Design a protein around this ligand. Structure first.
Ligand code: ANP
Ligand code: ANP
Ligand code: MG
Ligand code: MG
Ligand code: MN
Ligand code: MN
Ligand code: MN
Ligand code: MN
Lengths: 488, 488
C-alpha cells in the first residue's frame, strides 16, 4: 500500500510509537470498529467508521473523504458550488484524513468501538486550509515560537432534557436547505434553585452515566453542578494544554450528547433553547500562559498587580480583538441572546477583577498559580478549535504589540468602552472591517470562506424571522430552535 | 494551601482528611458532594471528582454567594450586580468552600458518591458572616466558654406521599420570583389513628428503605412512628451534641427526601401542606446542658423541683426570647398555621411539666439523666443551625440573667402569659423591636440581612393572598404550597 504519511512526513516519532500502541490495544480489547473523525466548521464531528483492517491501511495511506461538509451549512444549503481552489472556493476535491494516533479513545457507550481524530490534507500533502484543528495547530505553534504554552480550563453549561419524540416521521425530515423538526423534549427537573444538591441527585440516574463515560475517556472531569435554570447543568474540567484541550472539549461535547441519546435523553449546547424557562448557557474560557521550559504560570501577579505585565498585555489583546473574534467565540445566531446587560454575560470590551459583568474577568492573587483570565464571551456551541485559537491569537497579538487593557472597570455595565456585537451579522461586520490579524493567523482563504458561509446563514435567519427578531432580548425564534437544538 | 495558610483545620480535621481520602480510594468512589446549608437550611454546593476533592483539601472550592441573595423562588432580594459588604449587602463576591472532613459520609442511595459539608470563608480567610453553620459554631463556642455542651434529641415529623406528577412541563417551571408548580402527590395511608402499628407495616416497603439509609449513614436512629394525621410520620434519634447534632438534622432531612424521591415518593417537612386531611407537623427540640468536664446532665432536678436551678433559668431564657426567636424556630409563613390553641402546639410563652399544650415542656424525674426541656415551638422546615443556635442563645441568656420562667401552667391554653406571634410578619416585628440578644450572638450583619430577606418574602405572600389569609386557623393557601412543598 502507498505510504502517504511517511512520504509527506505527517507523523512524528511520538505519533508512530502511539500508532503501534493503538493497534496493540485494538487487538488486546477485541475492538471491531474505529471511528475516524474531524470537526467541521461548526465543531461537529464528521468522518467514517472503519474496521480494524481498514484502520491498519489508513495508518499508511490515510482515508479519502470529500470536502462536502465544509461547503454545506447546518441544514445542507449549498453555499459553495460543489459542481464547478483558494481563489474560487468551489468544487468537491478529495482530501485525505490522516489519523492522529495520539488522540485514540475507546468509546464506553458503544459496542467494541474505538475513536480517533484525523487531520485533513490535500493529496499533494499540504494541510487543507479550512480544517479548524489545523488553525488551532497554527495558533499553538505561533505561541510555542514565542516561548509559551496555552493552559485552558473548560467550563461548559448545557441543557439535559428527556426525549419525547425524535421527529423521525418523513414529514419532519426537512430537505437540503430546509430545517427538519426539532426533537421534542421534556425538562428533567425544576430550577431557579441554584446549586441545589437535591437537583444533582434527581438527575443522577443519567448524569452518573455521563460522569462515568467522561471519566472512562480519561477526561479530567472536575465538577458537576446544578445551574440556575430548570434542567441547566454545568460541567467543569481541570486545566489542559493547547490542541489536547481543544480535542478534549470536542470529545466532551460529543460524549455528553451520545451518552444522553443512548439512554433516551437529549443534551444540547445550544445557547438558549426555545423552551419556556430556559436561560442562556455560556462557555467561559479560563486561560493562562506557562513558560515552555520552566512550566511556570507567567500570569501570576506580584503585590500591587492584578496580573503580570505579560498577562496584562494578553488581556489587552483579548479586549482589542473581542469584536473581530466574536463570530468565532459566538458563532450561532442564538448565542447573541447573551449580549445584554445585567446578565453576568458581557455586552462590552471591558476587563475587571472578579466582576462577572466583564468580558475579561481576572481571577488572581499574588503568587497563586490559579491566577488566570476568564473570557466570559463564548457560547457552549462554539467550535472548540476556533474559540481557543481566537483566544491564543488575540492574546498573543496583545503581547507582541504591547496592548494596554486600560483601567479595570468597577461597573462593567456602565463602562465607557466599546460595545460588543449584538448580532451575528454585527460580529461578521466587525471581522470584515478589522480582518488583518485573523487573516494573518487563520489564513486569508479561511476568512473569505467563513465570511461567505456565515453571511449566508444570517440571510436565511433574516428571511425566516425578520430583522426585529434579532434583538438580543427578544424571544428565541423557531428558526434558532430548528437550526441548533438537535445538532449542537 | 488556603486551609493551612489560614489555620482552618484542627489536627483532628487533618487526620480525618487522611482517612477520608483513604476511604474514597478503598471504596472506589467517583464523586464527592461538597455542600453547605443556605439561609433556608437547603443544601447547596457542587459535586466534585476525586482529583478535584484532593485539590479542594488544599485550596478549597470557589463558589458564588448567589443563593444567600435569592429567596426560595430566586427573587433577587439583594442586588447581585452592584459591587459593595456588611453595610451594603449587595454584590456577588466569590467565597471559598472549605471542606470539613469530619462530616464525610457515603450516600447509600447514590452511585459511588461521598458527601461532605463545607464552611464558607472570604478569600481573606475570615468566616463568611451569613453562613448559618458558622452561627451555630459561634453559639456552641459561646456555650462552651461557660463550661457547657448542648445535648439535643432530634424529633422530626414529616409527610410521606407518593408522586403522581413531578410538574416538569415547561409551563410549570415558573421563573425568577415566580413559584413553579407544586409536585402532585397521593397519600400513602389513612390516619387519625395515632401510633397504629398496622400503619407502620402498611408503609414499610418504602419506610424500610428510609430506615436502612439512615442506619447506613451511621445516624443514631431511635424510632419510627405513625403520627396522628394520614401519611404523617415521625422519626426520632438518640441524643447528639452541638454542631454534630445540627449537621445530623440537616443530613437526616436531606437523606429522607432523596431516598423517597429515588423510589417515586415525596417527603416533605413543610409544616402543613395544602392537602385535605393533613394536620400540621412539628419539630420539638429536646435539649439538655451537660458539664464540659464531668459530662453530667446539669438539668437533673432534685426532689421538689422539676429542673435544677440552672435548667429553670435556661427555660426562663427560652420563654423570654421565644417571640424574638420565632422567625428562626418557625421561619416559614406556613409554620404559623401551628400558632393556635387546642392543637398540641404552643400559642403562648408558657412552661409546664409534661403538658403538650405548653411551649416549654419539662420531662424529668428526680435523679433522672433523661431530664430535659422540650421546646415544642419549632417547625420541621426550620434551618437546623438557626433553630438550635436560637435555643442555645435563649437558654444561655436565661442562665446569665437568672431569668425566672414563673409558675408551671396546668392549663397552658388558659395561661396569663405573653402570646406568641401568629404570623411571620409578627415574628419579624418581635425580632426587630427586640434584637439586641440575637444581634450580639448571630451578628448585626446577619440580623440586618435576615430581616430584609424575610420581610421581602412576607410581602410576596401578602400581595398574593392578602392579609386576611394569614389567620392561623385559615385554610392553607396555594402560595404556601407553591413556596414550600417541593423544596422543604
Ligand atoms: N492557571 C489557570 N489557567 C487556566 N485555567 C485555570 C487555571 N487555574 C484554574 N483554572 C480553571 O478555571 C476554572 C474555574 O472555573 P469555576 O470553578 O467554574 O469558577 P469560575 O469559573 O471562576 N466562576 P463562575 O462563572 O461563576 O462559574 C476550572 O476550569 C479550572 O481548571
Ligand atoms: N438528656 C436529654 N437531653 C436531650 N434530649 C434527650 C435527653 N434524653 C432524651 N432525649 C431525647 O428526647 C427525645 C424524646 O422524644 P420522644 O420519645 O418522641 O418524646 P416525647 O417528648 O414523649 N414526644 P411526643 O409524645 O411526640 O410529644 C429523643 O430524641 C431522645 O433522644
Ligand atoms: Mg463555574
Ligand atoms: Mg414524639
Ligand atoms: Mn455557570
Ligand atoms: Mn465561569
Ligand atoms: Mn409527635
Ligand atoms: Mn415531642
Amino acid at each position: 500500500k502507498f505510504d502517504f504519511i511517511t512520504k509527506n512526513n505527517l507523523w512524528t516519532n511520538e505519533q508512530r510509537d502511539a500508532a503501534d500502541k493503538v493497534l496493540a490495544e485494538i487487538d488486546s480489547l477485541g475492538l471491531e470498529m474505529i471511528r475516524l473523525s474531524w470537526a467541521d466548521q461548526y465543531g461537529l464531528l464528521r468522518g467514517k467508521s472503519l474496521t480494524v483492517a481498514s484502520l491498519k491501511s489508513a495508518f499508511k495511506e490515510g482515508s479519502e473523504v470529500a470536502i462536502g461538509p465544509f461547503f454545506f451549512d447546518l441544514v445542507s444549503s449549498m453555499v459553495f458550488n460543489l459542481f464547478t481552489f483558494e481563489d474560487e472556493l468551489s468544487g468537491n476535491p478529495t482530501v485525505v484524513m490522516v489519523p492522529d494516533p495520539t488522540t485514540f479513545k475507546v468509546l464506553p457507550w458503544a459496542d467494541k468501538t474505538g475513536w480517533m481524530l484525523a487531520d485533513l490534507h490535500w493529496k499533494s500533502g499540504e494541510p487543507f486550509p479550512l480544517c479548524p484543528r489545523g488553525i488551532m495547530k497554527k495558533a499553538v505553534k505561533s505561541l510555542s515560537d514565542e516561548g509559551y504554552l496555552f493552559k485552558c480550563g473548560i467550563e461548559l453549561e448545557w441543557y439535559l432534557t428527556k426525549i419525547v419524540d425524535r421527529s423521525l416521521s418523513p414529514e419532519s425530515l426537512g430537505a437540503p436547505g430546509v430545517q427538519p423538526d426539532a426533537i421534542q423534549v421534556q425538562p428533567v427537573a425544576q430550577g431557579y434553585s441554584v446549586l441545589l444538591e437535591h437537583h444533582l441527585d434527581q438527575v443522577d440516574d443519567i448524569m452518573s452515566k455521563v460522569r462515568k463515560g467522561l471519566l472512562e475517556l480519561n477526561l479530567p472531569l472536575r465538577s458537576i453542578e446544578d445551574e440556575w435554570a430548570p434542567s441547566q447543568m454545568e460541567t467543569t474540567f481541570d486545566v489542559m494544554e493547547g490542541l489536547e484541550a481543544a480535542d478534549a472539549a470536542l470529545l466532551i461535547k460529543s460524549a455528553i450528547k451520545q451518552i444522553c441519546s443512548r439512554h433516551g435523553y437529549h443534551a444540547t449546547f445550544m445557547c438558549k433553547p426555545a423552551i419556556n424557562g430556559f436561560f442562556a448557557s455560556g462557555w467561559h474560557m479560563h486561560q493562562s500562559l506557562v513558560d515552555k521550559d520552566t512550566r511556570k504560570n507567567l500570569f501570576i501577579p506580584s503585590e500591587g498587580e492584578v496580573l503580570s505585565p505579560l498577562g496584562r498585555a494578553y488581556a489587552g489583546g483579548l479586549l482589542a480583538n473581542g469584536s473581530a473574534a466574536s463570530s468565532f467565540t459566538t458563532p450561532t445566531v442564538n448565542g447573541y441572546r447573551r449580549r445584554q446587560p445585567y446578565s453576568l454575560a458581557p455586552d462590552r470590551r471591558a476587563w475587571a477583577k472578579d466582576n462577572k459583568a466583564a468580558m475579561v474577568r481576572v481571577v488572581s492573587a499574588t503568587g497563586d498559580p490559579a491566577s488566570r483570565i476568564e473570557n466570559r464571551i463564548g457560547e457552549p456551541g462554539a467550535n472548540p478549535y476556533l474559540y481557543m485559537a481566537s483566544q491564543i491569537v488575540s492574546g498573543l497579538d496583545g503581547i507582541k504589540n504591547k496592548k494596554d487593557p486600560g483601567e479595570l472597570q468597577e461597573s462593567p455595565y456602565d463602562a465607557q468602552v466599546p460595545m460588543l456585537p449584538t448580532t451575528l451579522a454585527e460580529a461578521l461586520d466587525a471581522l470584515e472591517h478589522d480582518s488583518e490579524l485573523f487573516r494573518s493567523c487563520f489564513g486569508d482563504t479561511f476568512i473569505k470562506y467563513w465570511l461567505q458561509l456565515r453571511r449566508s446563514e444570517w440571510a436565511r435567519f433574516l428571511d425566516a424571522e425578520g430583522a426585529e427578531a434579532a434583538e438580543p432580548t427578544g424571544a428565541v425564534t423557531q428558526w434558532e430552535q430548528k437550526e441548533y437544538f438537535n445538532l449542537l
